Design a protein around this motif. Structure first.
Motif, PDB file in Angstrom:
ATOM      1  N   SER A   1     -67.773  13.561  13.737  1.00 25.75           N
ATOM      2  CA  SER A   1     -68.308  14.540  14.671  1.00 25.75           C
ATOM      3  C   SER A   1     -68.348  15.899  13.989  1.00 25.75           C
ATOM      4  O   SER A   1     -67.640  16.145  13.010  1.00 25.75           O
ATOM      5  CB  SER A   1     -67.472  14.607  15.954  1.00 25.75           C
ATOM      6  OG  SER A   1     -67.933  15.639  16.808  1.00 25.75           O
ATOM      7  N   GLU A   2     -69.191  16.782  14.528  1.00 28.00           N
ATOM      8  CA  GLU A   2     -69.303  18.126  13.971  1.00 28.00           C
ATOM      9  C   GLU A   2     -67.985  18.880  14.090  1.00 28.00           C
ATOM     10  O   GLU A   2     -67.559  19.557  13.146  1.00 28.00           O
ATOM     11  CB  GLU A   2     -70.421  18.892  14.675  1.00 28.00           C
ATOM     12  CG  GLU A   2     -71.751  18.160  14.694  1.00 28.00           C
ATOM     13  CD  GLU A   2     -72.039  17.511  16.033  1.00 28.00           C
ATOM     14  OE1 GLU A   2     -71.097  16.966  16.646  1.00 28.00           O
ATOM     15  OE2 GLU A   2     -73.207  17.545  16.473  1.00 28.00           O
ATOM     16  N   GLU A   3     -67.324  18.775  15.244  1.00 31.94           N
ATOM     17  CA  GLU A   3     -66.047  19.454  15.429  1.00 31.94           C
ATOM     18  C   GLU A   3     -65.012  18.943  14.435  1.00 31.94           C
ATOM     19  O   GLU A   3     -64.274  19.727  13.826  1.00 31.94           O
ATOM     20  CB  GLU A   3     -65.557  19.261  16.864  1.00 31.94           C
ATOM     21  CG  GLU A   3     -64.577  20.325  17.334  1.00 31.94           C
ATOM     22  CD  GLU A   3     -65.264  21.597  17.794  1.00 31.94           C
ATOM     23  OE1 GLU A   3     -66.508  21.599  17.908  1.00 31.94           O
ATOM     24  OE2 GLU A   3     -64.559  22.598  18.041  1.00 31.94           O
ATOM     25  N   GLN A   4     -64.945  17.622  14.255  1.00 32.64           N
ATOM     26  CA  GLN A   4     -63.998  17.056  13.301  1.00 32.64           C
ATOM     27  C   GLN A   4     -64.309  17.513  11.882  1.00 32.64           C
ATOM     28  O   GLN A   4     -63.398  17.831  11.110  1.00 32.64           O
ATOM     29  CB  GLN A   4     -64.018  15.530  13.387  1.00 32.64           C
ATOM     30  CG  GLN A   4     -63.383  14.973  14.649  1.00 32.64           C
ATOM     31  CD  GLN A   4     -63.149  13.478  14.571  1.00 32.64           C
ATOM     32  OE1 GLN A   4     -63.769  12.781  13.766  1.00 32.64           O
ATOM     33  NE2 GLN A   4     -62.250  12.975  15.410  1.00 32.64           N
ATOM     34  N   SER A   5     -65.593  17.552  11.521  1.00 28.98           N
ATOM     35  CA  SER A   5     -65.968  17.951  10.168  1.00 28.98           C
ATOM     36  C   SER A   5     -65.518  19.377   9.875  1.00 28.98           C
ATOM     37  O   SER A   5     -64.948  19.656   8.814  1.00 28.98           O
ATOM     38  CB  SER A   5     -67.479  17.816   9.985  1.00 28.98           C
ATOM     39  OG  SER A   5     -67.855  18.084   8.644  1.00 28.98           O
ATOM     40  N   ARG A   6     -65.762  20.297  10.811  1.00 28.38           N
ATOM     41  CA  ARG A   6     -65.343  21.679  10.604  1.00 28.38           C
ATOM     42  C   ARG A   6     -63.825  21.786  10.546  1.00 28.38           C
ATOM     43  O   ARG A   6     -63.276  22.484   9.685  1.00 28.38           O
ATOM     44  CB  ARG A   6     -65.901  22.570  11.713  1.00 28.38           C
ATOM     45  CG  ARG A   6     -65.965  24.042  11.339  1.00 28.38           C
ATOM     46  CD  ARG A   6     -66.128  24.927  12.564  1.00 28.38           C
ATOM     47  NE  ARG A   6     -64.904  24.988  13.363  1.00 28.38           N
ATOM     48  CZ  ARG A   6     -64.680  24.282  14.468  1.00 28.38           C
ATOM     49  NH1 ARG A   6     -65.591  23.436  14.933  1.00 28.38           N
ATOM     50  NH2 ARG A   6     -63.530  24.420  15.113  1.00 28.38           N
ATOM     51  N   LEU A   7     -63.128  21.096  11.451  1.00 30.76           N
ATOM     52  CA  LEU A   7     -61.670  21.124  11.429  1.00 30.76           C
ATOM     53  C   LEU A   7     -61.133  20.536  10.131  1.00 30.76           C
ATOM     54  O   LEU A   7     -60.211  21.093   9.523  1.00 30.76           O
ATOM     55  CB  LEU A   7     -61.114  20.363  12.633  1.00 30.76           C
ATOM     56  CG  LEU A   7     -61.371  20.997  14.002  1.00 30.76           C
ATOM     57  CD1 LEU A   7     -60.959  20.046  15.115  1.00 30.76           C
ATOM     58  CD2 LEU A   7     -60.638  22.323  14.131  1.00 30.76           C
ATOM     59  N   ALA A   8     -61.700  19.413   9.689  1.00 34.40           N
ATOM     60  CA  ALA A   8     -61.289  18.836   8.414  1.00 34.40           C
ATOM     61  C   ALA A   8     -61.599  19.781   7.262  1.00 34.40           C
ATOM     62  O   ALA A   8     -60.775  19.964   6.359  1.00 34.40           O
ATOM     63  CB  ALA A   8     -61.978  17.488   8.204  1.00 34.40           C
ATOM     64  N   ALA A   9     -62.783  20.398   7.279  1.00 35.79           N
ATOM     65  CA  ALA A   9     -63.134  21.347   6.229  1.00 35.79           C
ATOM     66  C   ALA A   9     -62.177  22.531   6.220  1.00 35.79           C
ATOM     67  O   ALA A   9     -61.752  22.990   5.153  1.00 35.79           O
ATOM     68  CB  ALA A   9     -64.575  21.823   6.414  1.00 35.79           C
ATOM     69  N   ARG A  10     -61.826  23.042   7.402  1.00 36.25           N
ATOM     70  CA  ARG A  10     -60.865  24.137   7.472  1.00 36.25           C
ATOM     71  C   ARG A  10     -59.509  23.709   6.928  1.00 36.25           C
ATOM     72  O   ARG A  10     -58.842  24.478   6.225  1.00 36.25           O
ATOM     73  CB  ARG A  10     -60.736  24.629   8.913  1.00 36.25           C
ATOM     74  CG  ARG A  10     -61.955  25.385   9.418  1.00 36.25           C
ATOM     75  CD  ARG A  10     -61.758  25.869  10.844  1.00 36.25           C
ATOM     76  NE  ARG A  10     -60.710  26.881  10.943  1.00 36.25           N
ATOM     77  CZ  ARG A  10     -60.861  28.156  10.591  1.00 36.25           C
ATOM     78  NH1 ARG A  10     -62.021  28.588  10.114  1.00 36.25           N
ATOM     79  NH2 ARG A  10     -59.848  29.001  10.719  1.00 36.25           N
ATOM     80  N   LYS A  11     -59.081  22.483   7.243  1.00 38.67           N
ATOM     81  CA  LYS A  11     -57.809  21.994   6.725  1.00 38.67           C
ATOM     82  C   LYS A  11     -57.815  21.955   5.202  1.00 38.67           C
ATOM     83  O   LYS A  11     -56.848  22.378   4.558  1.00 38.67           O
ATOM     84  CB  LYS A  11     -57.511  20.607   7.293  1.00 38.67           C
ATOM     85  CG  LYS A  11     -57.031  20.618   8.735  1.00 38.67           C
ATOM     86  CD  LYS A  11     -56.588  19.235   9.181  1.00 38.67           C
ATOM     87  CE  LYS A  11     -56.015  19.258  10.588  1.00 38.67           C
ATOM     88  NZ  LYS A  11     -55.529  17.918  11.014  1.00 38.67           N
ATOM     89  N   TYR A  12     -58.899  21.451   4.607  1.00 40.62           N
ATOM     90  CA  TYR A  12     -59.005  21.457   3.152  1.00 40.62           C
ATOM     91  C   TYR A  12     -59.011  22.880   2.609  1.00 40.62           C
ATOM     92  O   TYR A  12     -58.350  23.173   1.605  1.00 40.62           O
ATOM     93  CB  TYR A  12     -60.267  20.715   2.713  1.00 40.62           C
ATOM     94  CG  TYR A  12     -60.171  19.209   2.820  1.00 40.62           C
ATOM     95  CD1 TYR A  12     -59.359  18.485   1.958  1.00 40.62           C
ATOM     96  CD2 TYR A  12     -60.895  18.513   3.778  1.00 40.62           C
ATOM     97  CE1 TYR A  12     -59.269  17.110   2.048  1.00 40.62           C
ATOM     98  CE2 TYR A  12     -60.810  17.137   3.876  1.00 40.62           C
ATOM     99  CZ  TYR A  12     -59.997  16.441   3.008  1.00 40.62           C
ATOM    100  OH  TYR A  12     -59.911  15.072   3.101  1.00 40.62           O
TER     101      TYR A  12
END
Length: 179
Positions: free
Chosen positions: A68-79
């Motif tokens: 999902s878009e929300e998951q992708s951004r959250l994962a990207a922020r985590k990285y």
DNA sequence: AAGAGAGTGAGGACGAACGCGCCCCCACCCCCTTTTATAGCCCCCCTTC
């Protein structure tokens, strides 16, 4: 139609705005793997969002595996935060979703032979190279993999609306070729 | 009135030029990797007899 494509993979690219030392990140990062001989980036993986991110020395990162878009951004922020914790001035600049992948089933077999004949200008059906039928949607720039089993895979979309619009356009066409 | 040197015709070896390549360097592209669903095809390895 009653069927909504389910996003199977989301690919997004973000810029951390800082040159990175790949060797240092691999030595310190928990899950990062670096192999300059194989690839020039650093592959890091996380579990809770279940995504894989490639980190380049130029500071740009590509995140994949998010559903999902929300998951992708959250994962990207985590990285991005993890790299920041390693002593780099990582930021979150111009985050963008580069590709979205969706899969769905029409709940009926499809006659690919008839579909390609009627849509030769968009359909490239080569069983020798690939059993599925490659349909290149025009109005949305979406490439669809239609299979005899009825499974349909949509890819190349930049926004979720494109996936739903593409499937809506193709569903009546597939219905006409029901087996 | 007679010697060396020379004109002329004429043959033989050598250097610059002409090709005629074979090797090289600089754009341009492709490939590498990662993710995902899908289905068919195919290969390596294991197991049964």
């Amino acid at each position: 139609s009653g069927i909504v494509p389910q996003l199977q993979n989301i690919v997004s690219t973000v810029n951390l705005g800082c040159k990175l030392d790949l060797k240092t990140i691999a030595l310190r990062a928990r899950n990062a793997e670096y192999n300059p001989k194989r690839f020039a980036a650093v592959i890091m993986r996380i579990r809770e969002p279940r995504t894989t991110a490639l980190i380049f020395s130029s500071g740009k990162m590509v995140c994949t595996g998010a559903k999902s878009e929300e998951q992708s951004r959250l994962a990207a922020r985590k990285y991005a935060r993890v790299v920041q914790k390693l002593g780099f001035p990582a930021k979150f600049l111009d985050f963008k979703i580069q590709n979205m992948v969706g899969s769905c089933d029409v709940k009926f077999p499809i006659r690919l032979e008839g579909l390609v004949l009627t849509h030769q200008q968009f359909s490239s059906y080569e069983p020798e190279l690939f059993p599925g039928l490659i349909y290149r949607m025009i109005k949305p720039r979406i490439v669809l993999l239609i299979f005899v089993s009825g499974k349909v895979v949509l890819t190349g979309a930049k926004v979720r609306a494109e996936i739903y619009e593409a499937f809506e356009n193709i569903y009546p066409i597939l219905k006409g070729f029901r087996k």
